Amino acid sequence: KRRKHSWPQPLKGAESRLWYGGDYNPDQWPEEVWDDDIRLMKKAGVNLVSVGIFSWAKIEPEEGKYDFDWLDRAIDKLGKAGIAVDLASATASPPMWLTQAHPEVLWKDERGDTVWPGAREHWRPTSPVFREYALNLCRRMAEHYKGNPYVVAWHVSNEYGCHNRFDYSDDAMRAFQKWCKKRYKTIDAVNEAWGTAFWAQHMNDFSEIIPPRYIGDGNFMNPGKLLDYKRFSSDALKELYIAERDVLESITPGLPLTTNFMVSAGGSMLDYDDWGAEVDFVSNDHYFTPGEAHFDEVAYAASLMDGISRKEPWFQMEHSTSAVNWRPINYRAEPGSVVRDSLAQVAMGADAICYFQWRQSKAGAEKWHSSMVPHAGEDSQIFRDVCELGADLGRLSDEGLMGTKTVKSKVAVVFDYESQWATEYTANPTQQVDHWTEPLDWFRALADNGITADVVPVRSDWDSYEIAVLPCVYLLSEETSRRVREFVANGGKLFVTYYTGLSDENDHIWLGGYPGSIRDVVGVRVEEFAPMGNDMPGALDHLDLDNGTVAHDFADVITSTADTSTVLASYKAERWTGMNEVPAIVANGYGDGRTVYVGCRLGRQGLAKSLPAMLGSMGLSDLAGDGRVLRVERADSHFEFVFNRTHEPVTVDVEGEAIAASLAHVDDGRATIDPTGVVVLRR
Amino acid sequence: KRRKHSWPQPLKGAESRLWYGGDYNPDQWPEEVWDDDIRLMKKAGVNLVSVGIFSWAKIEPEEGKYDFDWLDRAIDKLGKAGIAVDLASATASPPMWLTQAHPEVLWKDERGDTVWPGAREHWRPTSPVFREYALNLCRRMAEHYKGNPYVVAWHVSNEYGCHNRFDYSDDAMRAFQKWCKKRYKTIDAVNEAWGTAFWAQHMNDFSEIIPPRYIGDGNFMNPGKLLDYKRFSSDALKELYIAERDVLESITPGLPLTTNFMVSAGGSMLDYDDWGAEVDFVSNDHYFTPGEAHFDEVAYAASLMDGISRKEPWFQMEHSTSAVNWRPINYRAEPGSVVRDSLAQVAMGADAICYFQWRQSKAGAEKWHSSMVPHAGEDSQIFRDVCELGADLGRLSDEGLMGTKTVKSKVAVVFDYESQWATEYTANPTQQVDHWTEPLDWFRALADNGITADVVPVRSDWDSYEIAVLPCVYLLSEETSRRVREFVANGGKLFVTYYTGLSDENDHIWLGGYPGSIRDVVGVRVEEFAPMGNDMPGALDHLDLDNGTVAHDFADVITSTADTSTVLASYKAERWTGMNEVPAIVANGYGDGRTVYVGCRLGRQGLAKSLPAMLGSMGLSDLAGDGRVLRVERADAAAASHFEFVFNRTHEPVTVDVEGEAIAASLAHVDDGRATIDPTGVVVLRR
């Protein structure tokens, strides 16, 4: 069911190398400028660029008229310079002539208001009119470029669902109704799934399924329907991508196809693990979070990408050299980030490193988004760094890094797109809790304890690891619940947190005490929750634990533990709160395995501090190591990538021959690595 | 180009006195109250009121039916009492019969939702049918009141664009299409200006230009288009005002016309410098900012008005005696504000002082807005201050203040409405930075150093000043860039800050290092920005400078400086940030001039502390002074006679040296050349 892995191949006369480059948009610059791009690209070690992504209005400037010459010239200029082309379908966003002639392609928001042109991606995922136009352009691009010697892959569309994830038009309403019929078969199944006995929502047939349109601010949508609308929206965009991909493939067999994902700790527009089955190689867009989380979350996202790709080499389609344009405050990246963040992505399995974008735009909505050639030009620290990185990727290529894979960790941290979606409902126990923050917190706390985890999607093989973490995995089906029992019974070591296994996949609650489907594995029983916050005078805002850590946002009221369990920590609180001496962290044995249940949100800091005790109870005291650096390994040969995780230079022992270094010095088996520094070793 | 300055003239062709009064709405009160109004106006020294401003529904109660008699009688009563009338066109807001009959006049928001009656100004600036109705009323008003001996000016409409600056209806679509054709001539030029090669936005003809309508929350409009839509929206309202002005004038030639602007530090609904060319006298509405900025920003805004009026006497059409109605918390003004804020406006060149409004409303949306006669009545501190101020304006009139002009400062602080509009785009380096805060910060910091600046619109003559400041002037066209270059080369002393000259007039980036069009003038090169804030844990929220100030919000990463420059200050920071020892304040010599580049936001306090060293580098240490007070002077041509206005800027009484004869004082006194001024106090001297 997964497509066979197929990676973009070198140009004639060229050898196999790490791909390096970024989005390139010659149609935004006078043709005169292109020769300068080629000169700077060669200087930087660029060998691949992605072209034509938003070029629909240039390629088809009016309906039924096509203009390829400019693009043929650009591609030829790149190719004869030894730079390969990842060619877009150009179907990311339609021209004004198209939308003026066919306003029915525009998506509608919850209130039924039309979303107009003015920005990008303003089209309905289920519009048959838009699909027709897109497939036409796909056919004509593929027919024109099928003989081109410089094209090495297809970049289908761009970031499906970045702006048009949700549509509430009648096209969407009809498509959702059909999607529900496919999923549930009978209207009574839908009624039971969504619990429509409540609030007189019973439906007599599929015409009575309407999308989660506007219901008045502050009012509460049917949560089953809302969750399914997210599943449906991801499937709808997926079916369109499949159609475009198949048209391109029909005309250019043997050219690998991808589309760019938006995988980040807090990004959940689509079920990207599901989508990963539909590409020839998985590719990602990731932009750093400014501040204290910058490095760790870059590493985390790249690890999840390696999980999505099932440890096959994957493609970093976009990231930024420094500031983006779209945040309330676009902080710059710390000096060193260009090489460092990129080599983190390589460490986590990327065999291609690309940026948005090659040359910083001088006009338009993204002119303030950093690029490889800044507004300042080639005399810039960023461009010097871009050049250093290209040379580094060349050296890693000479060393044969291509095709190696990131080693299997002893620990898997589970991520679940659908659980994230379930946690987004507005009448959960607290709207402060999303699934997504917990696996990040665990990844980081494990790293503080010198352990590099793999981030593994819930449908993938986390139960083949020695140790795994279920961090706020809100949904657990009976099937997943069974995988959990067997994982532990067979000798696995499993961490489980609050907000795990509250409901099944239809968001029906597992009754009898939380977590209702696996409470006998973890040996705790929760009767009630105690959310915390600062929005109510005198309400509970934190809970100290007796192990020197502090819970925030959420705590389980654990009222019994198994006779096989050990309480590792308990809350301390004023008596009237009822939370004093309630168990907070509980260890258990079950079959041949061990669990630790963490009944509250402890964050990176509290988890990191609690980990020695928790690992101890599991028989894993020997696992901990040096948390000042992250150590990431690829192997077919072993390559170790070592990153300073702190704000001060650190010295650590390193084995092997240093083959790359940025802001770091290796001498006599020891590396002094500056903040934002990295060393790469081979042996 | 500019209209010849024409000032409202006194009743009976007598002496031109300082005008004093406010908005007057007899149609809101039973007629017995009108006689009470007259008694109290006389006691207060009121000599001018503005009437009929929102009276459309009373004057034209049904289509083509007119009821003038109440207004005729009110104007007669006023004039016989010696009180002049500033007559409105009454076209500010339409009656229910009009909007009920013609829903198509109502403006539409970005989502296409109709904005209904229920408040005011709910009409599309480019509606042809509303224009027909407005011009008809203008004509009927002018024909009826022509030759009235008590009417001294026209108050055209009211605050254009206060509520209807933006319309997204099809009338606006058509008008914006024509406006783009006028500006750019060809669709190729529009495409080039807006950089439409990006995101497949290329347009084949002018029918493919649509207004910046709803694109979904959190999405990014074409910034060239958004900026031009603000230009267009200002121009569209200006064209309507010009049409109303022209009809009125064609019927009552010689009667001076104005419309009331909304000039304040943070106000930018329209390009008010552009609009200033279209009125016979420039008039403003300004309402104090509660808290620590109160006095300084009153002074600033009035200075900017004097800039817009090119130093011609101007008209304070509205302000508040105390609290307004429209803030989340309507703080009252400090006692003394009635006289003090009004005399600050006079000091900055106003020959008329008026309030919204004469009598506090007992009903309606603005009943909680303070007024000259409070709900409390004539027995109130506010009415007593109102009477004191009227008496003071009488005394200043006796001393011949009218017609003098605010003296030219040694420093011009530059303000650019269009730069403010550009900084409003939502995908800039940081959305915390607006152009408008910086010129205010510099004005206050200069005042802290005993210097009263002129606030000067960018198209005006700042390059004729000894010293000028470009404070976050985000846009610099080629033309303005040349003026900067010549200004410095010829001996001008120039301050330039971060967020200046990033782009040309169509928001195209000047390439090669910021500020891309004048980096050789200031002798610095910026490769990237280091914005700062408190919204991301662990990101920088500040940078200490090595001169004992602290930057917030934004810092330039200066990576080189010219051979002729001198670093006056640099950042101190943790090494990992990359900002340690990066230059923060850099002086340069360029031709016979001097510059200082300030690459970060230092605020009033940091700028005030840094100014002595900065001025020093320009060769100007002697420009210092006592910042406890603001001194503002007016003078006649020949600079024969001088008037000095002195304001306490602090919270304790101050005593300062003053030359000349005291002619007015509030919460203050002058004795043998020493002015003792209480907080919120003011003295006025004649030399």
Coordinates of N, CA, C and O in Angstrom, one line a residue, chain B residues 6-56:
Chain B
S6 N -7.6 81.4 3.8 CA -8.7 82.3 4.1 C -9.3 82.0 5.4 O -9.8 80.9 5.6
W7 N -9.3 83.0 6.3 CA -9.6 82.7 7.7 C -11.0 83.2 8.0 O -11.4 84.2 7.4
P8 N -11.8 82.6 8.9 CA -13.2 83.1 9.1 C -13.1 84.5 9.8 O -12.3 84.7 10.7
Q9 N -13.9 85.4 9.3 CA -13.8 86.8 9.7 C -14.8 87.2 10.7 O -15.9 86.5 10.8
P10 N -14.6 88.2 11.5 CA -15.5 88.5 12.6 C -16.8 89.1 12.1 O -16.9 89.7 11.0
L11 N -17.8 89.0 13.0 CA -19.1 89.6 12.7 C -18.9 91.1 12.6 O -18.0 91.7 13.3
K12 N -19.7 91.8 11.8 CA -19.7 93.2 11.7 C -18.3 93.8 11.2 O -18.0 95.0 11.3
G13 N -17.5 92.9 10.6 CA -16.2 93.3 10.1 C -15.3 94.0 11.1 O -14.4 94.8 10.7
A14 N -15.4 93.6 12.3 CA -14.7 94.2 13.5 C -13.3 93.6 13.6 O -12.7 93.2 12.6
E15 N -12.7 93.6 14.8 CA -11.4 93.1 15.0 C -11.4 91.6 14.9 O -12.3 90.9 15.5
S16 N -10.5 91.0 14.2 CA -10.3 89.6 14.1 C -9.7 89.1 15.5 O -8.5 89.4 15.7
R17 N -10.5 88.5 16.3 CA -10.1 88.0 17.6 C -9.9 86.5 17.6 O -10.4 85.8 16.7
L18 N -9.2 85.9 18.6 CA -9.1 84.5 18.7 C -10.5 83.9 18.8 O -11.3 84.4 19.6
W19 N -10.8 82.8 18.0 CA -12.1 82.3 18.1 C -12.2 81.3 19.3 O -11.3 80.6 19.6
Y20 N -13.4 81.2 19.9 CA -13.6 80.3 21.1 C -15.0 79.8 21.1 O -15.9 80.6 21.1
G21 N -15.2 78.5 21.1 CA -16.5 77.9 21.4 C -16.5 76.4 21.2 O -15.7 75.7 21.8
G22 N -17.5 75.9 20.4 CA -17.6 74.5 20.2 C -18.8 74.0 19.4 O -19.5 74.8 18.9
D23 N -18.9 72.7 19.2 CA -20.0 72.1 18.6 C -21.3 72.5 19.4 O -21.3 72.3 20.6
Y24 N -22.3 73.0 18.7 CA -23.5 73.3 19.3 C -24.7 72.6 18.6 O -24.8 72.7 17.4
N25 N -25.6 72.0 19.4 CA -26.7 71.2 18.9 C -28.0 71.5 19.5 O -28.6 70.7 20.2
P26 N -28.5 72.7 19.2 CA -29.8 73.2 19.7 C -30.9 72.2 19.3 O -32.0 72.1 19.9
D27 N -30.8 71.4 18.2 CA -31.8 70.4 17.8 C -31.9 69.3 18.8 O -32.9 68.5 18.7
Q28 N -31.0 69.2 19.7 CA -31.1 68.1 20.8 C -31.8 68.6 22.0 O -32.0 67.8 22.9
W29 N -32.2 69.8 22.1 CA -32.7 70.4 23.4 C -34.0 71.2 23.1 O -34.1 71.8 22.0
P30 N -34.9 71.2 24.1 CA -36.1 72.1 24.0 C -35.7 73.5 23.8 O -34.6 73.9 24.3
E31 N -36.5 74.4 23.2 CA -36.0 75.7 22.9 C -35.7 76.6 24.1 O -34.9 77.5 24.0
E32 N -36.4 76.3 25.2 CA -36.1 77.2 26.4 C -34.6 77.1 26.8 O -34.0 78.0 27.3
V33 N -34.0 75.9 26.5 CA -32.6 75.7 26.8 C -31.7 76.6 25.9 O -30.6 77.0 26.3
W34 N -32.2 77.0 24.8 CA -31.3 77.8 23.9 C -31.0 79.2 24.5 O -29.9 79.7 24.3
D35 N -32.0 79.7 25.2 CA -31.8 81.0 25.9 C -30.8 80.9 27.1 O -30.0 81.8 27.4
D36 N -30.9 79.7 27.8 CA -29.9 79.4 28.8 C -28.5 79.2 28.1 O -27.5 79.7 28.7
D37 N -28.4 78.6 26.9 CA -27.1 78.5 26.2 C -26.5 79.9 25.9 O -25.3 80.0 26.1
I38 N -27.3 80.8 25.5 CA -26.8 82.1 25.1 C -26.3 82.9 26.4 O -25.2 83.5 26.3
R39 N -27.0 82.8 27.5 CA -26.5 83.4 28.7 C -25.2 82.9 29.1 O -24.2 83.6 29.4
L40 N -25.0 81.5 29.1 CA -23.8 80.9 29.5 C -22.7 81.0 28.5 O -21.5 81.2 28.9
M41 N -23.0 81.0 27.2 CA -22.0 81.4 26.2 C -21.4 82.7 26.4 O -20.1 82.9 26.3
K42 N -22.2 83.7 26.7 CA -21.7 85.1 27.0 C -20.7 85.1 28.2 O -19.7 85.7 28.1
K43 N -21.1 84.4 29.2 CA -20.3 84.3 30.5 C -19.0 83.7 30.2 O -18.0 84.0 30.8
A44 N -19.0 82.7 29.3 CA -17.8 81.9 29.0 C -16.9 82.6 27.9 O -15.8 82.1 27.7
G45 N -17.4 83.7 27.3 CA -16.6 84.4 26.3 C -16.6 83.6 25.0 O -15.6 83.8 24.2
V46 N -17.6 82.8 24.8 CA -17.7 82.1 23.5 C -18.1 83.1 22.4 O -19.0 83.9 22.6
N47 N -17.4 83.0 21.3 CA -17.8 83.9 20.1 C -18.0 83.1 18.8 O -18.1 83.8 17.8
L48 N -17.9 81.8 18.9 CA -18.1 81.0 17.7 C -18.6 79.6 18.0 O -18.1 79.0 19.0
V49 N -19.6 79.1 17.3 CA -20.1 77.7 17.5 C -20.3 77.1 16.1 O -20.4 77.8 15.1
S50 N -20.2 75.7 16.1 CA -20.4 75.0 14.9 C -21.7 74.2 14.9 O -21.9 73.4 15.8
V51 N -22.6 74.6 14.0 CA -24.0 74.1 14.1 C -24.4 73.3 12.9 O -23.8 73.5 11.8
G52 N -25.3 72.3 13.1 CA -25.9 71.6 12.1 C -25.1 70.4 11.6 O -25.5 69.8 10.6
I53 N -24.1 70.0 12.3 CA -23.1 69.0 11.8 C -23.8 67.6 11.5 O -23.5 67.0 10.4
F54 N -24.6 67.2 12.4 CA -25.4 65.9 12.2 C -26.9 66.2 12.1 O -27.7 65.4 12.5
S55 N -27.2 67.3 11.5 CA -28.6 67.7 11.4 C -29.4 67.4 10.1 O -30.5 67.9 9.9
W56 N -28.9 66.4 9.3 CA -29.5 66.1 8.0 C -31.0 65.7 8.2 O -31.8 66.1 7.5

